[PDB]
Design a protein around this ligand. Sequence first.
Ligand code: MG
Ligand code: MG
Ligand code: MG
Ligand code: MG
Ligand code: MG
Ligand code: MG
Ligand code: MG
Ligand code: MG
Ligand code: MG
Ligand code: MG
Lengths: 379, 379, 379, 379, 379
Amino acid sequence: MRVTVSIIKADVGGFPGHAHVHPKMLEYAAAKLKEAQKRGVIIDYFVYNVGDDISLLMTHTKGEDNKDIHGLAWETFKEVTDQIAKRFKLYGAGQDLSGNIRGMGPQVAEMEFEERPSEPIIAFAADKTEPGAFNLPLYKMFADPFTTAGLVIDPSMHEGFIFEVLDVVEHKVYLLKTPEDAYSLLGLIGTTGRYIIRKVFRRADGAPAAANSVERLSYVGKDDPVLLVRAQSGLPAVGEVLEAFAHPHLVHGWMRGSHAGPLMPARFISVDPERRIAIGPKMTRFDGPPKVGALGFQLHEGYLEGGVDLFDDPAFDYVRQTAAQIADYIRRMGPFQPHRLPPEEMEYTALPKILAKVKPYPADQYEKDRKKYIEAVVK
Amino acid sequence: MRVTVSIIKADVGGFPGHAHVHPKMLEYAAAKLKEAQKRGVIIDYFVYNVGDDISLLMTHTKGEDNKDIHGLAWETFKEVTDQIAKRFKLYGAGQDLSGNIRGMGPQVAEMEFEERPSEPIIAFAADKTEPGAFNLPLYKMFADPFTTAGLVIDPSMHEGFIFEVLDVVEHKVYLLKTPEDAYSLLGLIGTTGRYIIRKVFRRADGAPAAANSVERLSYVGKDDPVLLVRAQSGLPAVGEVLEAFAHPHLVHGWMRGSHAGPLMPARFISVDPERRIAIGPKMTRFDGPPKVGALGFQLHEGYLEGGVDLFDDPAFDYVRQTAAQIADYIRRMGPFQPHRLPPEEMEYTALPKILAKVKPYPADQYEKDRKKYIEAVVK
Amino acid sequence: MRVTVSIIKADVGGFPGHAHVHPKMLEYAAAKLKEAQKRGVIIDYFVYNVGDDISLLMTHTKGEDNKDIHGLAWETFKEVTDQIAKRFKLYGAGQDLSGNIRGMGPQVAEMEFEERPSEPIIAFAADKTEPGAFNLPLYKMFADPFTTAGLVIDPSMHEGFIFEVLDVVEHKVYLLKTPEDAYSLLGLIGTTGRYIIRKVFRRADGAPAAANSVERLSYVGKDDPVLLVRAQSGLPAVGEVLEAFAHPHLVHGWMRGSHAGPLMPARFISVDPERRIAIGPKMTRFDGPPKVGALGFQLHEGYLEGGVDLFDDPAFDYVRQTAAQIADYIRRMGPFQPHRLPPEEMEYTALPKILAKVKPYPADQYEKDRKKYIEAVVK
Amino acid sequence: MRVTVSIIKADVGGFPGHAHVHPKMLEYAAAKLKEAQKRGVIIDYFVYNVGDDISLLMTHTKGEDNKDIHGLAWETFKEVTDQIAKRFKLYGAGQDLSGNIRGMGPQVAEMEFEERPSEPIIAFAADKTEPGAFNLPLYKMFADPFTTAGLVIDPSMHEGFIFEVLDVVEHKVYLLKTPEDAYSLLGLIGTTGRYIIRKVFRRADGAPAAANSVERLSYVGKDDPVLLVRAQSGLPAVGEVLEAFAHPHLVHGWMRGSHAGPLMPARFISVDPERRIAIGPKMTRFDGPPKVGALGFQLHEGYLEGGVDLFDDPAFDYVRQTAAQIADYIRRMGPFQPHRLPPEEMEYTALPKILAKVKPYPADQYEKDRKKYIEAVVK
Amino acid sequence: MRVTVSIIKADVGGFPGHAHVHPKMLEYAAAKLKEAQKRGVIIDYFVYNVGDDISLLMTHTKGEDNKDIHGLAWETFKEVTDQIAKRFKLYGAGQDLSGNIRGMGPQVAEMEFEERPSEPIIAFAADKTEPGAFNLPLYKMFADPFTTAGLVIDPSMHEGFIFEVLDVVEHKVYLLKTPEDAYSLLGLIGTTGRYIIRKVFRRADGAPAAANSVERLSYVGKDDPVLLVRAQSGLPAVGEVLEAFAHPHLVHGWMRGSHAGPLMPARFISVDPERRIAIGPKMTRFDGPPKVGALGFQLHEGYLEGGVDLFDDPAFDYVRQTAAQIADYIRRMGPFQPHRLPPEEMEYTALPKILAKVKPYPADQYEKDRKKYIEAVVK
Ligand SMILES: [Mg+2]
Ligand SMILES: [Mg+2]
Ligand SMILES: [Mg+2]
Ligand SMILES: [Mg+2]
Ligand SMILES: [Mg+2]
Ligand SMILES: [Mg+2]
Ligand SMILES: [Mg+2]
Ligand SMILES: [Mg+2]
Ligand SMILES: [Mg+2]
Ligand SMILES: [Mg+2]
C-alpha cells in the first residue's frame, strides 16, 4: 500500500524562553492525535520536541499537501497555544501561528511512497538553526563516498541521486544529479541560507529518499527544520545516514538566529513508544548550541513502530564532546564574524539604530580634516 | 552433575535497520523458553541482544549438538519471525532462518562439563563483526602473559592451553598448544577471516575452557559471533578474561560487513535477572562501531544466577572513549583499504558492475597510445 | 551518651568470581540486623558492598571487641554463606569463615566515644587491596597540610595527631605524633605491607579520630579493608577526609592479590537509606582496578542517618578518569615489577614450581662452560 | 620551453638497518649529478632521502623514459653502492640494483610539459609503504571537494580530472574521469595493493598534473614510492595538494612490509638549497611509522629553485601527533589483521613452514574423534 | 673476521650533582681512545653519556673479558677523574673506581662474533635505574609476538631464543628457551632486582644476540646499565628492538636509587660522528625521570659507522609525553610504596635510625594499656 509520512513542526511556546517545551504540551498533542487516529484521519503518530520545537509525526493515506492533515496539525498547535501556552504565559506563546500550513511559520516535511517490504525511516528535528543546516548531512549521506560506502560498494546505488534545490530568495528550483553534477550542486548548497536541499530522489527509479522542511523567505523561512529520510535497499543504510551527522559542523542560528555554532547530535531525555511521546534536549548556553535529534522507525501498514533514539551510543559521545569544545572556542569571538553571521543573514540587528546616531565623514574629505576632528573629540 | 551450556543466536529482524532489536522479540523469546523450562526441556535460560542479534543462553543436560535444544532455538526464532518480525516488517525479518542448526545462519557456542564447586562463566555477544573478532581476545586470555598473570604466577596454569583452530575455507582443524606452539598458532589466527579459534581446552586435564561460534564458509559463516568462557580455578580469572577486551582492537565487519573498526566493550542498556532478559546496546554511526557485551553468571545445578554486565565500570569508560576516537579517525579514510576490507573479505562489492563498464587497456600497448587515448577523452 | 560504631566486613562469596556480591546477600544481612535491632542487640545498622566484600556497619553500646556484636556479624555471615552463597555455588562461598572475629579472616574497624552534639562520620570500604592502602589517605588527612587546611588555619587542630602503627610481621605497636614525628612515621608507613596505621587519636584530648581494619599476618591479614573516620570540630572536615582520596594512588592488590594499581574512588550503584542497603561498584578489568567507596552518616543517639555517597560529584569524575588511564598504562607492563608485586608481597606465586624444573648453574663455573652449555641447548 | 622533471629513487643501503641513509651517500650523489649538469646531461637536480630511500630529482629536456637519464640514475646508485654502501657494509647494500630502470627495483616518476609562466611543483617521497599509499591523497587533491575547494569555486577546475589507474596484478590500464566516474574509480583504487593511480591529467586540456611511481608486480613493485605533482592555475593549489595529506591515513608497509600504520607527514631534518641536498626523517619504532616528505620548487628554464619543506608548520604538528597516537594504538594488536596485512599482501610470511609442521584434521572426521585427539594431546 | 664490541661505562663525576657530565670529560675520553686506536689497542670507539654516566664503546679483536681493553677503560676513567672530575670537584668525583673491571662499579656489556655481511648494532645506555630495567624490553624484543612480528612471520626466527638469567643474590645462572619456557622465564625476570637477563643467544645457531651489563650484588651491582643488541637477519629488526622501548614502563631507581618511575626513551642533545662523541640528556625533576638513549651503528672490519640517535622521531615524542605525565602522577605518592621501593630494594634508608628512637610495644600487652599510653602521650 501507499503511505504518506508527514512531519509538521511548530514552536508555540518555550519553557523557559526558547530552552525547552512544557511537557503538558506534548501530552496534549499526543491526546489530540490519538483522537484523530480513532476517527481514521491518520493511521499513527509520534510527538516529540528538540528544544522549543514540537514535531507532530503522522502517517496517513491522504497524500502530500493535504488540507485535512495540515489542518489537523494547525488545530493541534492552536489548541496547545490556547489551552497551555497562553495559560502558562510561555515565551513566544502561539507565535508560529488555511488550508496549506506551509509559509505560515510551521515547518513541513512529507513523503508519499509505496511501503516497502521493510520500511525503515528516520525523523530528525534540529533546534536553533535553519533548513540549510541539513545541506551538509544530506549531501554527505547521498553523495560523499567518505560517508556512504554504498555509493562505491553497493551496485544498487551506483547511479546516484537527484537533489531538488530550492533558491529561497528568488523562488527557483534546481535539479542536480550526483555524481556528475556534484561540483555544481556544491556551488549552490554551500550557500546554506539561499540554496537548500528540499528533496532527494533515487536516480535509478525516482523513488523519494528524503524531504527537508524549507520554504521561500518572506519573517518566515529560517525556522528550525525537520527532515525525513528513508533508508536501506538502494537508499543509504541507517548507519550511513547517521554517519553524515558524525562531524558536528558549524550551522547558522544559535542565539538570536544570528550566530554560527556546531550542530550537536543529541540524545533524547526520554522516549516512550507506548505513549507515543519523546522529550528532547534543552538549549542552554547561548540558547544552544544548536542540536539535532534522530528517531528511527519501522513502518507496517503505516503503523509507526519506534521511535528509537539513534544518537544514543558512546560513539556519539565523542562527537558531543567535540561540539561542546568547539562551542566554547567559538564563543570567545563574541560579536565578530564569522561567529556572528553576515549582516544580511542575521535575524537580529541594531545597524539602523547605529547609523542613525553615529556621524559619517566622506572618506576623501576626512583625510584633510582628521587632525581637527580628533582634536574636537579630544576637546 | 554434568551440565551443557548453549548459546544459540540469530538475527531475525532489526529495529530499525540493523541497529537494535524490538523489545517484544526478547519478551516473546523469554516466554517461550519459560514454557520449555516448565516442560523440563531445559533447566534455565537468559535472553539478550547486542545490536540486532538475539542470543538464547540455555542450560540443560542434553549435551552438545542436541537436536531438541537446536530445535527449541529454531522454533523460538521462527515464532519471533512470524509473530513479531514479519508483523512489524522489521528489517531483515526472519533472514537467519533440521536437525542441527549449525551452518543454517544462526550461531552456536556450547560446552558440556562437570559443574564445578563454583562454576563462573561469561557469555559474550558481538555485533557487526565476524567470529575471528574473538581471535585476539581468546589468544590473549589463554596465552599472553601480559593479559593473564596466572600463566606466570599460578602454578595450576603453567602447562597452558590447547586451541582448536578451524580453517573455515578448506574445512580443516588444527590443534595447537601454548606456550610452545604460540608462534605457529599466531601464524594462523592472525588471519582472522580464515583461521578462527573454535574451542579452547585446558592442557592439564583437557577440560573445556571456551567455545566460539564459528562455521565453515559457504552466504553463511561470517555471522556475528557469540562466545562462552569458563573462568577461575586453573582457567583465567574473570578479570583476566575481561582484560583481554580492554584494548578495543580493530575487527572486520561494521558497515555492510566490509570495513574494519574498533571493538567497543559496551554496557547493556538494562539487565533484569528476574525476567531473564538484558537489552544490549545499539549500533549507530556507520552501523556500529562493532560492540561486544559480557554477561557473567554462576551456575548451580544448571540454574543461571545472573547475568551481571561485566563491562560496567568507569575503567572501561576509558576503553569506550578510545574506541569512539579510533572509530572517528578511521572513518576519515572512507572507501580505502585498510578501512575498507580486502576485496575477497568484503561482504558487499560492485567490482563486477565496474569492470563490466570501464574499458581496460593492456598495459604494454597502452604506453604507445597514451597520448591519443588522453586526447580522445579530452575531445 | 557513649556509642560504639563497628564495621565488620567479610567476603563469603562473589558473583561472579570476585567481581561483585549477589544482591540477596545484602537483603539477607539487612533482615538479620533488623531482627537484632528489634531485640536491642544493636541500635542501628547499614549493609553495603564494594566489590565482593559485604560491610556490616552497626551502632550499639556494647563497646569495642564485644563478643555479642562480633558474634552477631559471624552468625549473619555464616547464615548468608549457607542460605545463599552455598546454594548458588558463589565463588569463594563462605571462605572468610569464637568469640573475637579478629584474625579469622573478616575485617573489623570500631571506635567508641561520647556522641558529639553533631556526630558526622564516614565509612569507607576498599576492595582488591590491603589495609596499607589507607596509609597514604590517613597520613594525608591527619598530617599533610596540602590536604587538611585545618592543620594550619584551625587553631583547634594545631597540636596534631597520634598514629597507632601496627607492624603486622613482628606484631609490635608504635605511637607516633605529628607534626614532630612525621618523618619517622613516614619511614615506617611508606612500607605499606608491613607498617599499617590502625588507629588515629586527636593529640589535644586523646579522642578517637579513625580506625582501620588491620590484623597481624598469619593466610590472613592482607584482606580488603574497611575504615571509619570521624569528622569536623577539631577533626578534619568531611571534605579534608575526602580530599585525601582525590589522588588515586597506587595500592597493592588487584588481580590475584599480586599487583599494584590505582585506587579509584567510586560511586555506589544505589543507596537506599530506608532499606539500609547500598550496592557498591563491580570489579572488572584485571579484577579491579581497586576501588574505595565512601558513605557519610550523622549519628543521633546511635541512630545512623545516611548513608550519603561522598564520591558522587563531577569533581571526582576527573579522579576516576585518571585512575582508568593509569590502570591502562600500568597493565601494559604485564608480569614485571613494579606492576607485579615484590616476590614476598605477592599472594600468588609459582616460583617453587619453576625452581624445581629449571636447572641452575653456579655462576663462577658457568663462565668457563657457557659455550658448551649453549652448544648443548642448540644441539 | 618543454621540460621533463624526473624522480628516480632507490634504496642501496640503510644506516642502520632500514632506518635512514648515510649522509656521504647523499653527498656522493649530489657530486655526481653536479658533474652531469656540467656536461649538459641535465639541467638541475636535488638529492634527498626519506628513511632509507634516496630520491634523485632531475630536470632535463630528454623526455620521459630516457635511457641516458635512467642510466645516469643507475650509475649514480651503482657508484654509491660500491664506493659507500659496500664499503661501510650498510644494510641492504646495493639491493635495489639496461636501458629502462623501471621494473628493476628503483622507482620512477616523471612528467614532461611546457614550463608555465610560473611552474610550482611538489616532490613527495614516502618510506615504509607502497605506491597505493598515495591513492587516497591523489584522489582527494583531484576529486574530493572537501579537500580541493577549487573543484567547486574555481571555474577553471570544474571539468575535473583523468586518472590513469594501473592494475599491477593483471597489467591492465584504466582511464577514469571525475566527477562522473568517481564511484567506479573508488571501486578500484580502494584496493590499494592492486589498482594504483599512476598518472593524473587535467580533463580541460590533457595537461599532466601528477605522476606516481608504480610498476607491475613481478620481488618488485611494492617498493617505497615517489610522487610529482604540479600545482596552481587550473591544477590544485599547493595548499590543496598538502591538505590531501592532512589526515594521516593507514597505509600498507611498515615493519617487514607486512603491516598497516598511519602515514605521518614529516619534516626534513635539514634542507640545503645551495648544496642541493635535504636529509629526511628516520624510521624508528617498528621500522616507521611510515612517513612522507614534501619538497616544493619553482621551475625556471628547468632550474629548480627550492626545495622548501612543505610539512614544516605547527598545523602539521597536530597531524604528526595524531599519527604518533594512532601508531601506538594499532601496535597493541601485535600479529593480528588488520594491523598485520592480509596473507597475500604481506611481504614476509612463515605460513609454509607452519603448515609443514602442524597436523591438519579434515573437519568432518575431526568431530567424532575430538575427545580422543584431546586426550592424546593431554596424555 | 671476528670482532668484539665492548661497552664499558662509569660515573666518575656529575655536573651538577647526578644530573649530567661535564663536556670536557667526554672530550678527554675521546682523545684517549683516539690515542689507543693509533697504537692498535682498539679498532674504533664512540664516547657518550646519558645523565651522569659515560659509556666507552670500543671495537677490537681481543675478545670478551680482556685485561687490556678493561684496563684501557679503567685508565681512561681514572685519568678523567684526576684531570677533570677532581679538578672541578664534580659530584661523586671518581666514585665508580686489576685486571677485570667487572664488580669494581663500572658496567660492562660485550659480545664477540663473526662480523656479518651487514652488521647493524644498537648501543643503549640508561641512567637512574638498574640492570633489570632492561628485563622487560629484552623479553619483549626476543619473545613477545606483540613486539617482534618476526617471531611469527619470519621463518628464520621461529625457533626463538636462549636467555641467560643471572640471580644476582645467590650468584646462579639459568638458561631458559622461548617460546616453550616463556612462563618460567617470566616467573624469574619479573623480579627485576634479583633475576636479570645478562645475555641472549639465537636458538637456531647459538649466535650472540644481546648483552646487558649486570654483576652479582655485593655496594655494587645496581649501577646504571648499558646494553648491546645485534639486529636483523634472524635477529629482531632494528625497529622491533626499538618497539620494545615504546611503552615507558616503570623501573626501579630514580631519586636516591629508591623509587619507581617511567623509563623515558630520550633523544641525545647532540651526536658528532666525526669527533666520535654524543651528549645525552640531563636528569632533572627528582633526579630523572630515568631515561634510556639508543645509538645505532653499522660495523665494517670493526669500524663503527654512527652513531645514529634511534629515539629521534615524532612517534617517540608521544612516548616521552606519556612518561612525563606518568612521572607527575606517580610523584604525588611521595614517600609511599610502590612509588618508594620495597625496603630491601632501596639504596637509601633511615629505618635503623627510626627504630632506634621510636619505642615499640609488644602488640598483645599494648591492647590492655592503650588507654594509658594515649593518656600519657596526651599528658
Ligand atoms: Mg522559541
Ligand atoms: Mg526552536
Ligand atoms: Mg541485521
Ligand atoms: Mg548483527
Ligand atoms: Mg572474593
Ligand atoms: Mg574483595
Ligand atoms: Mg631498506
Ligand atoms: Mg624504504
Ligand atoms: Mg652520579
Ligand atoms: Mg647515573
